[PDB]
Design a binder for this molecule. Structure first.
Ligand SMILES: [Br-]
Ligand SMILES: [Br-]
Ligand SMILES: [Br-]
Ligand SMILES: [Br-]
Ligand SMILES: [Br-]
Ligand SMILES: [Br-]
Ligand SMILES: [Br-]
Ligand SMILES: [Br-]
Ligand SMILES: [Br-]
Ligand SMILES: [Br-]
Ligand SMILES: [Br-]
Ligand SMILES: [Br-]
Ligand SMILES: [Br-]
Ligand SMILES: [Br-]
Ligand SMILES: [Br-]
Ligand SMILES: [Br-]
Ligand SMILES: [Br-]
Ligand SMILES: [Br-]
Ligand SMILES: [Mg+2]
Lengths: 335, 335, 335
């Protein structure tokens, strides 16, 4: 809620419970999942052709005690600033969305779950540190609906292989016309020595790509993503306590939703990602499910939701991917 | 300070020092105790019979360095959202006050100390994770001053016995009339296997109950709480480095205060909690003291206070409960 | 941005990258250095002679992942409240700037680097916990431009020698007249037993002092600081993994800047600190460099900057102080 400069502090409180049998063997786990969010975003008009802007956003976990676990799962999601010039484009630097999320964003619309391939700190698919992003709308004002973006990922040598990266570039192009949108996005980067010493994944570069199609009009939302990755998607073998990256993955995400005037937004979805050439096992499913779910919007400040994952991962999955379903029920106050 | 929706960011900065001899052997300890608070609370009118709301609140410690200890004692206090409907009642889910605090709230009014039995993450007496709370004012609008509440506590299997719980229900009823208020509150819950493996406490359920009486009118505040607990109150034997829960406790809390027009709010108080059937020792006092103290309110944004604990715990207490007095002097800017 | 009481929430997002060769052997290091800041400051008019106030401020790192490193470098910078009375003076308690920073503040003006001797949690030179500060402007209203301050530092017995202190007093006096300012500041304090068990530094008290001269007018800023310290400045011998405090240091800081109407603020600077009588090595340089740099201010909400450290520390420095240069390029949205 808005606190020549327009600055806006924002957030929400999310009362959130997950239901699974036992949740060690499930898609989402079991129990209290309450958290809150806080951030600001602002933009300042510098002149008629130039705006300056910034955004910061934080996750506060609501399901930890006030003892020594208090900080578990607290983190900054976003922290960047930039400049937007005339028809030239925008440029920002900091922690932000990786460019391949320009595609994955199409399916990442579910009430609680979904977007399973947009890992955080995973090269270009999710939120990530140290990125320089250039974005361009309507091709310099010459072509209504043709947007593009390029992004430069600086190396992050962290203590974990999962959270690290090397230098890389990625980019994306999209075209929209009367409710239809089409997008493609691709990136590659160096892997770090720590990533390469892992027993899962083989190679010295990582690539992610995805294409998107979507129809967004007349209270209907339909969307589709297909993508693949090389040496990029993080993976654990829970049976030998083995970690790393899948050599290859192949990914599909489908979503159908409708918006009723009275607030009810039903959701239907399917998601599958399968890893290939995983050392010592071959091909495995990482994600496999159908979704049903709904959100009820009381207004712009208040909603509740149920999200139900009909898990299709079989009880024998070779890496130890859980097989039970998960339901989520949430209540949200936002501003 | 207020930032169809009414949302309010709030907080305070508390300059705070504690004085004790040595503070290893004291009630409150010795030294810098500065901290700050930040939160939001908002409510949105959905229609004439329905409001939606949320609250989040965080504790930032001000007495840690900017080195590796920086986060010590930082935590979310509250994070919940809910719906309030007509005369039906309110319902919220998230981290919130346990229902037995509906009684303990009567005495928890001192400038710095007091409220010694309202432990955090301790079933129903204090702030706790994963609770669903229903509250009812004036009995559905049929009975002015008769309020009640029921609360459902979801199991929290944490890494510590102190911070965990099992599933449980608790509730409370109160009646108020012309400055007088009367309250009763009770809850029980399952204890977790971790709690049961402790060497202090014996049993597979936990119960807390308390009654409250108070007079709140004509610039006078008088209040009284009596309560008991089974297998609920956390306790340490500092002499053998032994921890767990007291089998039984018996608790009394008394408070007298007056408000002068010029801002001066003197406080007088007494508090005693005694554990029974503590393994290998029998009966012990956990808390035993008189208080004198005062707050000076400059206005609604600024106050100072002194709070002085006249400790009655004797120097031989069998669990190693400290015996020296503690003074606290604070200065508070809030908004 | 301002959210009888005037309260102001504020912050910035800083997109920030450091360039060094390799940065293990450099002044500033290499890579992503993005972070954000959030705080409030408020003041309340209690009557015509009395204002009450508070300030809190936090550092959120933007260059950590959302995994287990998420909190690295997050901390409260400031958290205090106080009262300002008529001509008498102001008094505040909490975490705040140490009084010797009243001098070091003169040179601490560079776009990214500079202020190298104003260590955090280091007695009086930097931000520190548990201080009571009295400040006086115009000598009780009797002497325009003559300010003074005294400060009382409470002992902080922490787990690290670097972050601890004993009880101490420090103070400062300054005089300003038509763009010229002159300042002196001094403090001493007890060292704690932990500090004394270190292999670097010898003695049972710590003192810091500094003098400042500055010209601040006509879009010119020139300033100069000289100071010394005994048993106060923290130091590591990276060759034997040895830590502690330099017995003596001698410090010089120089800065020249100009402000163009169009926003461009060029900076020129020199900084040297040298430790003496360091056990097992004698005299060593801790800091030695020239700076060139600039900030471009688009407006009051947006700026970019480059800051370039021309390191003069030689490749043989005896404690292992790095010798390569560092450049920093930043983009800042603030409110
Ligand atoms: Br917490
Ligand atoms: Br995500
Ligand atoms: Br993830
Ligand atoms: Br990051
Ligand atoms: Br654009
Ligand atoms: Br649907
Ligand atoms: Br801290
Ligand atoms: Br409490
Ligand atoms: Br507690
Ligand atoms: Br909790
Ligand atoms: Br009610
Ligand atoms: Br009284
Ligand atoms: Br983080
Ligand atoms: Br500093
Ligand atoms: Br430092
Ligand atoms: Br501190
Ligand atoms: Br003054
Ligand atoms: Br210059
Ligand atoms: Mg934090």
């Amino acid at each position: 809620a808005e606190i020549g400069n327009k600055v806006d502090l924002y957030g929400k409180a999310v009362g959130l419970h997950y239901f699974s049998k036992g949740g060690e063997n499930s898609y989402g786990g079991n129990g209290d999942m309450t958290y809150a969010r806080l951030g600001f975003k602002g933009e300042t008009q510098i002149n008629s052709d130039l705006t300056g802007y910034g955004q910061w956003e934080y996750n506060f976990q609501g399901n930890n005690s006030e003892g020594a676990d208090a900080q578990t799962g607290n983190k900054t999601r976003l922290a960047f600033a930039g400049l937007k010039y005339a028809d030239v484009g925008s440029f920002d630097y900091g922690r932000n969305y990786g460019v391949v999320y320009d595609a994955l964003g199409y399916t990442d619309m579910l009430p609680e779950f979904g977007g399973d391939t947009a890992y955080s700190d995973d090269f270009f698919v999710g939120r990530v540190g140290g990125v320089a992003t250039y974005r361009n709308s309507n091709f310099f004002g010459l072509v209504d609906g043709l947007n593009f973006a390029v992004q430069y990922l600086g190396k992050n040598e962290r203590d974990t292989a999962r959270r690290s990266n090397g230098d890389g570039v990625g980019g994306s192009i999209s075209y929209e016309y009367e409710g239809f949108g089409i997008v493609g996005a691709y990136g590659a980067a160096d892997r770090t020595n720590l990533q390469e010493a892992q027993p899962l994944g083989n190679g010295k570069k990582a690539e992610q790509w995805a294409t998107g199609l979507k129809y967004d009009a007349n209270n209907i939302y339909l969307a589709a993503n297909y993508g693949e990755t090389r040496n990029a998607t993080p993976i654990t073998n829970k049976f030998t306590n083995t970690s790393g990256f899948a050599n290859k993955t192949q990914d599909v995400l489908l979503v159908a939703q409708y918006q009723f005037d009275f607030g009810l937004r039903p959701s239907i979805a399917y998601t599958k990602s399968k890893a290939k050439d995983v050392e010592g096992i071959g091909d495995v499913d990482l994600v496999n499910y159908f979704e049903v779910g709904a959100t009820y919007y009381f207004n712009k400040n208040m909603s509740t939701y149920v999200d139900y994952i009909i898990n299709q991962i079989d009880s024998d999955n070779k890496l130890g991917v859980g097989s039970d379903d998960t339901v989520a029920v949430g209540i949200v106050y936002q501003f």
